[PDB]
C-alpha cells in the first residue's frame, strides 16, 4: 500500500495540476534501471498496452442469466447426478431457456454455481492425460467470508470534458490488510467425500501440493466481488493428505484463516491488450461466497 | 460582444499558435476573480460536458 502523486490535466490544454491517490504494488513496478528507486515507479498495464476506465457506474457483480434457444433448435438437459461429462443418459429434459446461471469469473474454483447433489463427482477430458484439468462437483457448500474491514474512499475528480476519474483516496483510521475466513469441519467433511471419490485406480495414494508458480491469474483463486477483483489465496488446502486414514484428518477442526489479496486491473481471457481500471466501493468490503466446484492438475513431474 | 485570442495546435505538434475570434458573453463566464481587471473566461459547457 503506497500513497502516490502525479500530474493531471484539466479540460483545457495547458492547465495541469498535481494530484494524489493510493496504489498497491501489483499495479506498478519500480524502475531499477536507474541507480536506485529514488521514488520512481511505473504502471505495467501502461507500458504494455493502452488504458481506460471500466464504466465505474457499471459494477462487475453477477446476475442470474438464462440462455434461450432459436426456432427449430432446443436444449436438452440430463437429469442424472452421477452422470459424468460425457456418455449416455436417460433422464432427459427438453428446454427452451436454460436454468438460471450465475456465470461468475473464478479461477481454480467455482462460485455461486449449480450444485451436484447426491454424490461428489470428478471428471476430466482425459484423466490419463496428466496435463488435463480435473473438474470437481461437490455435494454441499461452505460459507466463505473473504473481506477487507477497511472502508474505501473515492475522489470523483474531473479530468476531461465530462471525463472523471474515481481515485482511491485516503482511508480512515488504522488500515489493516484484508483477510478471508472459512469453516473447518464442513470443509473436512467435503474433503472426506472428495478423497473417497478420488480412488479411481488406487486404494491409498493421494497428495496435494501447491502450484509451482506462474501467472497470478492462474497461481491463485481470483474472482470479482463488488467490482474489485479479489484474489483470495489457496494455501490452506494443499497442506492436506487424506491418504491412509480419512477419519484421522477429520479431527483437526480449525477456523481456516488466510490472507486474501485484491486487484484493480485485469486482462480478461488472457488477451494481452488495452487493460481497464476498477473504482472504489466506498465502505468496508464484505464478500460472501458459497462453493460448488474445484479444478486441479495432476503431477506429471513425479513417479 | 467581445473578441478573444487563444492558443491552438498547429499541424506540427511542436508548433502552436495564437489565433483570435469573436464571441459573446452568454457562451462563457468570468473566472480568476480579480473581479474586474481584464478577466479571463471559460466556456459554460466545457467545465461540465464535451
Amino acid at each position, epitope marked *: 500500500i503506497k500513497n502516490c*502523486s502525479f500530474n493531471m490535466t484539466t479540460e483545457l490544454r495547458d*492547465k495541469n495540476r498535481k494530484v494524489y491517490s493510493l496504489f498497491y504494488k501489483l499495479d506498478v513496478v519500480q524502475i531499477n534501471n536507474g541507480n536506485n528507486s529514488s521514488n520512481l515507479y511505473r504502471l505495467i498495464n501502461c507500458n504494455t498496452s493502452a488504458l481506460t476506465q471500466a464504466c465505474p457506474k457499471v459494477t462487475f457483480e453477477p446476475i442470474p442469466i438464462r440462455y434461450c434457444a432459436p426456432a427449430g433448435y432446443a436444449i436438452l438437459k440430463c437429469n442424472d447426478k452421477e452422470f459424468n461429462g460425457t456418455g449416455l443418459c436417460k433422464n432427459v429434459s427438453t428446454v427452451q431457456c436454460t436454468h438460471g446461471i450465475r456465470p461468475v469469473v473464478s479461477t481454480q474454483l467455482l462460485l455461486n454455481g449449480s450444485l451436484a447433489e447426491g454424490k461428489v463427482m470428478i471428471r476430466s477430458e482425459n484423466i490419463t492425460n496428466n496435463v488435463k484439468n480435473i473438474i470437481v462437483q461437490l455435494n454441499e457448500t461452505v460459507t466463505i467470508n473473504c473481506t477487507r474491514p477497511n472502508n474505501n474512499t473515492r475522489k470523483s475528480v474531473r479530468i476531461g470534458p465530462g471525463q472523471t476519474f474515481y481515485a482511491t483516496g485516503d482511508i480512515i483510521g488504522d488500515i489493516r490488510q484484508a483477510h478471508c475466513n472459512v469453516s473447518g469441519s464442513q470443509w473436512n467433511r467435503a474433503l472426506h467425500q472428495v478423497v473417497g471419490q478420488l480412488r479411481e485406480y488406487w486404494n491409498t495414494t493421494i497428495i496435494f501440493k501447491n502450484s509451482s508458480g506462474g501467472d497470478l491469474e492462474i497461481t491463485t483463486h481470483s474472482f470479482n466481488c463488488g467490482g474489485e477483483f479479489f484474489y483470495c489465496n489457496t494455501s490452506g488446502l494443499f497442506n492436506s493428505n487424506w491418504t491412509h486414514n480419512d477419519t484421522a484428518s477429520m479431527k483437526p477442526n480449525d477456523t481456516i484463516t488466510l490472507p486474501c489479496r485484491i486487484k484493480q486491473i485485469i486482462n480478461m481471457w488472457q488477451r494481452v491488450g488495452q487493460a481497464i481500471y476498477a473504482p472504489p466501493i466506498q465502505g468496508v468490503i464484505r464478500c460472501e461466497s458459497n462453493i460448488t466446484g474445484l479444478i486441479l492438475t495432476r503431477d506429471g513431474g513425479g513417479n | 460582444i467581445k473578441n478573444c485570442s487563444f492558443n491552438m495546435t498547429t499541424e506540427l505538434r511542436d508548433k502552436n499558435r495564437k489565433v483570435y475570434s469573436l464571441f459573446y458573453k452568454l457562451d462563457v463566464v468570468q473566472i480568476n476573480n480579480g473581479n474586474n481587471s481584464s478577466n479571463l473566461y471559460r466556456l459554460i459547457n466545457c467545465n461540465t460536458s464535451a
Partner: antibody
Amino acid sequence: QEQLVESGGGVVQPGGSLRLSCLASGFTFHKYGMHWVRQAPGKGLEWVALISDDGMRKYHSDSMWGRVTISRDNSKNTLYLQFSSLKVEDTAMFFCAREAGGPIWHDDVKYYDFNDGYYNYHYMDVWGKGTTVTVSS
Amino acid sequence: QSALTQPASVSGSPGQTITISCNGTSSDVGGFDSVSWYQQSPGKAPKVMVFDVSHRPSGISNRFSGSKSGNTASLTISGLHIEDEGDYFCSSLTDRSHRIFGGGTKVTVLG
C-alpha cells in the same frame, strides 16, 4: 491589481509585543503565500520571514527566528506577525510582498500544485505599501 | 549570513551600457539557479529586475540581460535610462529553503 495594505506599525516600546497585520484586495488570498521583509534607514533589505498559503509550512530568519512568530487568517485574508521582546534593532520599515504567481511553464504548459494550488520558490511580483516601525525605550 | 556582496554605489552616463556584478557562495548561488535581482529607488517600492536569470521578468525592456557563473551573478544593461537610478539587490535561494539578499548597488546618472 493585487493591492496590499499594512497596519499596526508605528512608534512602540521595547520588550512587549507587536501585531503587525497585512491585508489586501483585488485577488483571492485563499491560496497565495506571503513574504515579510524589512529594511532600516541607510541600510538595505533583510528577509524577515515567509509563510505559505494553507498553513502547512513557514520559515523564519535565524536572527529573528524565535523572537517573532508568523501567522495567517484565511477567512479575513490577512497575514499577521507577533513580536516578543521588542528591541531597537527592529527599527525599520516593513514590506508585505506576494509570490511569483501560481504555475510553472514548461513547453508552454502551465503546471499547478495539488488542489489547483498556486506555488513557487521564486521572486515577488508585488510588494506592499510599507509600514514604519520605531522601537525605542 | 553573508549577503551577496556587491558595491554599495555605482555610476554611469545615460545610454552607456553597464553591468552590475554581485558575489555569492556555494550555499545559495552554487546551490541553485534561482538568482534574482531587485531594484528600489528613493520614494519607490521595490520591483524585480531579473528572475530565471537567462530570461527576463514581466513588462521590463529587452535590454537587461542576466547571467551567472559559479557562485557569482551579474546583469548587463544597455541604454542607461534616468528613471532607473536607485539601489539594486541581487538575491539567491539558500539550500535550507531560506533566501538572502545583497548589500545594495546605488545607480547614479553621470552627466
